[PDB]
């Protein structure tokens, strides 16, 4: 019954409008974040989505108990009558707490007045992207963590237990990207309102190679090699020929085309578009080549064989030439 | 009184009113002693869906929680009071959560889908109908002919193992509707209850987890993948009984069945999630793109020496219309036993 | 002034909590639909969306008025102060109440004490469906009504109206279905909590077969007829007789594939699966009998002839006998 | 400080559950409709959204205040302390009133007693079209405006301004329709539980031609014409006029199952059917006539020389004709 | 202790229905933007998705405090017990205030009476688009900010700042468009229920030709070069010359076809598609040329072989011709 009537003493007369030490030193907040998963990165809307367990921890004077000897673990309906932190996170799409079967929230008040305030958020933020190297990159996304009304002046942001304050990036399982480094980063940004306090958290990201091998590279190694079987093919045989050439020619600039689609309008030159502009340079190529053999076979069939003949050995060798000097200059 | 008019609808008022008035939701039944004790029940109503895009199911239950909070407790009436769901606002309960949740909502129409059953003792029967989309982490490597665990992990949100204790209420009888689950690509093969006690930073947590084992229905990947893979394969030996005279003829049947092979393998991976392992559909698919290749490159071979000699090249597909066959129906037979 | 005095003494006092006759006999709710759409039918998420006026009687003793000799119009609001049963779509995914230009519910009140409730739910219902027969088949959806937590010991549901209770069937405009029958169904179904009231309405819906005579079984009558035209071109036209068994082969593999892509994920075969299996075989064997002509018209021109001649009846023969069997087994 | 308590003692002792004049004459409340635009028209769900402000009048003696002689604008949060009519939008899939930075929202209060409410909804009305005559069709789409619970006794319906209440519809914006015709309808529409008011509000939808003459119409052409060029090509070119034979008529098939596709599973057959069924046995006649030329050039060369010849007019010629009874037949 | 009491007396019979000054001047409203972001610009749908830090600035007397000589920032659940403007934006398809962790909503109040009050809004705005010139055009986007309810008589908005109100359009990051000029404007737009304040935020976007180069330019050049091909090739390769121009032909067409599905259903005419009419022209002209040198080559092989050789030079030229005009044109 003591602990009934204490709790209702710390809410009588209590102003939810005003921060802790209203009109004195800025109330510091500590943040700590478990993160649950990285749910999905998307290129085309330049985002990626997270999970999280979001951590404050502040102290109110107005919520100090002297009798209990223990820590109270509140119903968390009791948050919508104490004041919190306008924690926001400034690159930010959309989030929201998960409300099943309650607000995913959590109250733990202690005997000295501090606060211990949970939240479950699952959060869309904003990363953009540097796609040139695609799909050998690395890419950089954050949470950029700031007061919304609050200059540095009421109130102050640190991330508690320091480079250990994030937990769980080491047991991220993302498919086609693997979490490389993370850092914490804390700040006071000025605007035309005052200076603001900021967290910041950072990844590094890098793609896995795997799937684009499987999607793209093999087969346009495999629609080059079959632009090959041209040469071992009697040139006698324009339809066959002319069918090898316009085949690869084709199923190359829908390999280019298609992928495009798959990403976002980028104006530049990805990696991936100069291997593939490669590869149809060299299927063009072996065309022309047929062309050239069937425009001169009449009055020169030496001249002709021997072209094809060479065409065996000098296509191949060169498209490892490319591959190797592809290859090294992106890795 | 000893026993009162059941029938009384003012002294229930007044009974129910008593039960409220000065009741604290802010504190949990046996504030500071012993944890309250809650006893989980699920009846499954339906798997809604299982993505491998984005690796998570959707399920549809009837969630139930079980607690006494002697404050609620009720001395006149012998019945057991089943009250309108909004009073639930006015009560305090366990704040349960779905660990493993991605979305989840509470049925709405025509009221919100909850009940609440008092009973003379204090105990509280908490009803609640849920969706949940859930993360289910899968492992493609022997898809098609793949096994995936899907779970629901059940946690307290801030009330500690010293707060909060959950249990099965009936044991390994707890969940209910696995068995009339119909799922078109997948059957429910297995599932297990869980209970655990998982410590974390912010002390030790009591946790509930539901398990199932989905297996994966190989019809439908029967008829769309490795029908058409087989009927192109044989499409691609049609070739060694046509004249090698007819260039254009044996070189367009190879073109076709070697790119009509990379859009099956290309198309199926566009399908799933961009996986960086090949799956064991790609070895097969692989596998007829081998084949469909070497027949190609017979017409290449045969195409290259039919003139100086016409005897060795009519012998090439004169074995090519049987050592092809043979091989594929061997490779056939080396896959299939291997994966099953 | 009297009508105003009247609604404020039939609320003063009365408890939400619980429902009229609160511990005798059980509460016998009447439940009238009237349907407004069936908005749609989805074999891929194998549901049905469906819109409606749901109308609930019942009578609260509570709410009884002696002064008016009306029926008393209560503004909606009205409803969050008066005890409603817990009646809920056993069988739905998603339901709303239409919220535009206010909540789409209404409250009547007669001097007896009995209540109208009306809303106005959109429900997405999920409806299993058997599609071996697809697209000559025949599908049966239901919706469930039940209570949430009240046993038959406190409430009772049953169709006002009979027979009669759910209107707007027939005028239903579903483009690709028919309702063929609607039934209408009372039980008490028993479950660990007790037995619990159950309402039940069906639909019987008929596909109509139009839109696939025209999507699908037209061109693979024309890609079958397409293939025969080969037995009527010279068997020295080796590319343009293999051009077109290649071209009707692969046109049929991708009319039978594309179309399962278009349903969900079954593992049985479709009576349109069927058909397609049966003219792929009628445009393989063409193919096969070019082979054969192929093969043999050096040795034997006079037998690859003939096969050419009879291969121009025995084909559409065939095809037709296979059409004929399989619609008057389906039919 | 005099319209301070003015406003207060408006509200004092104020029932919302309780209509205007009570248990007299019916209120008659006067809707009014700025259309701000039509979003968006679509065949596949068979709907059409629209945006407006849509604005009700009608007077609350309950509201009438003696000593201001002006017209009172309160902040909007008024209408929630106020009876409202309980207006829906009888064939409306999904509705929402707007409400950023505030509920688009606006209470004017007249000395008299009369409200003006104001409020900006965007509105997914269903549209049920008939396309035979796509996509040179006519679509007549309406938003059907009733009272939820009350009958004609209690509340009456009127559009306020007669045939100039809907404005806005002139500067409708949509690249695929003309709003040729809109009209105002008043109507007392009878049920089950009584006669209810019924404003109306109906436009028709021009299709505009353009986009289809340029997707589905030149490609027809060019098909059909591309179709011809084999009776100018040797009859000695097999492969060729075969290539071009198959080419045309599956071209020509994949234009019209593509077409379906992007609308609604319609059993019935559309006027852009009608052509491209059209071209198909034009472009179908072309290959068999190169079948029956293939078929007769040995024995018959003179005759298949003819054969050609006559192709070379009898075509293009009976297109054009096809065409013009096409095109005429339809406008 | 004291500055508890002194907001409760300022709240103390305060009405929201009434507006500040009500009954006499109007409210002056400055009105603050900071572009966070433009997160995206949709030619199908014909609207654009913007996310920024909404300011409103106006005095209401009612707030005034003599006591405290500091600037409150009171916890922005305050803003619902306060009057607010009724500002809207008129081009407003859907829009939001973002709700993580709590609205991300801001009250100041200023011993004075005036009252900052911030929103930070993600809207997606109308922006009806002329795509004649597509993919070498311009669009100008805006947003429209309006008083819902009250009229010229009792709100006046105005840009707090100036032509320097706007701020971030600099820093927004749009990769197939760049931002080249925005403008403020005020107004009062006059309607049947009277005269209204308006405010108006106007961007122009010039789209990044790189992506269409790449993806619609380029194939059209290799294809009608690949269409060339064939005139190298000997006239008795029937196949394969009718091969190469069935392909040409055909790709052309879905090149055209592709493109405007990936759009909305416009009836006019773009500068892409006059460019891939041009192209198919000559793609269909390569194939033209051939049924002719084949109708032709047995009673005239000397004239075949010239069609030929001409068709070599006469093509390249030509269609260079076309690119030099079309792309002078469209730069004008
Ligand atoms: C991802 O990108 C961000 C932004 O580009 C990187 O953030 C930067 O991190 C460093 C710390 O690693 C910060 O620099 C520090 O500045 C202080 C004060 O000048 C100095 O004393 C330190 O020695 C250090 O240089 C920097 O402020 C910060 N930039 C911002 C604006 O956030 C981040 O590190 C990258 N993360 C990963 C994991 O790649
Ligand atoms: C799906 O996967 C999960 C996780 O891999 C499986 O859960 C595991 O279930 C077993 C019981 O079957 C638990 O092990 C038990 O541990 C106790 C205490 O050490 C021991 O006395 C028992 O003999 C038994 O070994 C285990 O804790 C649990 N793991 C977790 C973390 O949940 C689950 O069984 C799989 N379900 C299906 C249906 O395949
Ligand atoms: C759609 O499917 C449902 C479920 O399969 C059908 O519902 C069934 O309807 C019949 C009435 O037509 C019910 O049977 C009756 O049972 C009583 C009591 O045993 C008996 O006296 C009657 O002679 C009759 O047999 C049956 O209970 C009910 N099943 C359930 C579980 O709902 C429905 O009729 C089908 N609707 C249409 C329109 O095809
Ligand atoms: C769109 O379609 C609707 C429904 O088919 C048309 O509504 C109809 O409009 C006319 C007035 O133009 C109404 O008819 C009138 O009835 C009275 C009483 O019988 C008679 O005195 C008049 O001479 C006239 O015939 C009719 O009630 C109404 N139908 C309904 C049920 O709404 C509408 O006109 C079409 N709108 C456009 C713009 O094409
Ligand atoms: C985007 O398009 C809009 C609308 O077409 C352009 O808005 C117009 O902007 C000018 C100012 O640049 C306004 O004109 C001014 O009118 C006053 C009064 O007549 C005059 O004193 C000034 O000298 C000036 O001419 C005009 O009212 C305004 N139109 C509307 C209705 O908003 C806008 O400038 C374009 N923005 C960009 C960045 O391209
Ligand atoms: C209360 O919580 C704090 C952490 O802030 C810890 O130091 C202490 O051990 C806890 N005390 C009790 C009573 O368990
Ligand atoms: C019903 O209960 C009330 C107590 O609230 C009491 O006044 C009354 O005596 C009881 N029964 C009757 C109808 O006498
Ligand atoms: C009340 O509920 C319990 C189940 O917890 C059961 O034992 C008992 O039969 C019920 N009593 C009544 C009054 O029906
Ligand atoms: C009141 O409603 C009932 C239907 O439940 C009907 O019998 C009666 O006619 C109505 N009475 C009045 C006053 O209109
Ligand atoms: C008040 O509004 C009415 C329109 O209903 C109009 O007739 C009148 O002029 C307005 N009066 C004032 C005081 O402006
Ligand atoms: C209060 O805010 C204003 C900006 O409106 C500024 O001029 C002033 O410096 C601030 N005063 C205090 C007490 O910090
Ligand atoms: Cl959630
Ligand atoms: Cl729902
Ligand atoms: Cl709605
Ligand atoms: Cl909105
Ligand atoms: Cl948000």
Chains 1, 3, 4 share one sequence.
Not at 2 to 17: A, C, P, Q, S
Not at 28 to 48: L, P, R, T
Not at 186 to 195: C, E, I, K, L, Y
């Amino acid at each position: 019954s003591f602990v009934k009537e204490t709790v209702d003493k710390l809410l009588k007369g209590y102003d939810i409008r005003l921060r802790p030490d209203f009109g004195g030193p800025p109330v510091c907040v500590g943040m700590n974040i478990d993160i649950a998963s990285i749910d999905m990165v998307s290129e085309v809307n330049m985002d990626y989505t997270l999970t999280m367990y979001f951590q404050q921890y502040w102290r109110d004077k107005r919520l100090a108990y002297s009798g209990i000897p223990l820590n109270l673990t509140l119903d968390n309906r009791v948050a919508d009558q104490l004041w919190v932190p306008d924690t926001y996170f400034l690159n930010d799409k959309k989030s929201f707490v998960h409300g099943v079967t309650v607000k995913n929230r959590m109250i733990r008040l202690h005997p000295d007045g501090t606060v211990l305030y949970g939240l479950r958020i699952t959060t869309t933020a904003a990363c953009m992207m540097d796609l040139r190297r695609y799909p050998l990159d690395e890419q950089n996304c954050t949470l950029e963590i700031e007061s919304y009304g609050y200059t540095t002046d009421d109130i102050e942001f640190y991330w508690r237990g320091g480079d250990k304050a994030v937990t769980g990036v080491e047991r991220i399982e993302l498919p086609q990207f693997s979490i490389v480094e993370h850092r914490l980063v804390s700040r006071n940004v000025v605007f035309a309102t005052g200076a603001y306090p900021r967290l910041s958290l950072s990844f590094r990201l890098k793609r896995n190679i795997g799937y684009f091998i499987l999607q793209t590279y093999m087969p346009s190694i495999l629609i080059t090699i079959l632009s090959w079987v041209s040469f071992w093919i009697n040139y006698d045989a324009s339809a066959a020929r002319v069918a090898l050439g316009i085949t690869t020619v084709l199923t190359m600039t829908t390999i280019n085309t298609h992928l495009r689609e798959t990403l976002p309008k980028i104006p530049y030159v990805k990696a991936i578009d100069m291997y593939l502009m490669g590869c149809f340079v060299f299927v063009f190529l072996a065309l022309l080549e047929y062309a050239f053999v069937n425009y001169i076979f009449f009055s020169q069939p030496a001249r002709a064989a021997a072209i094809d003949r060479w065409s065996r050995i000098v296509f191949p060798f060169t498209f490892s030439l490319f591959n190797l000097v592809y290859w090294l200059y992106y890795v």
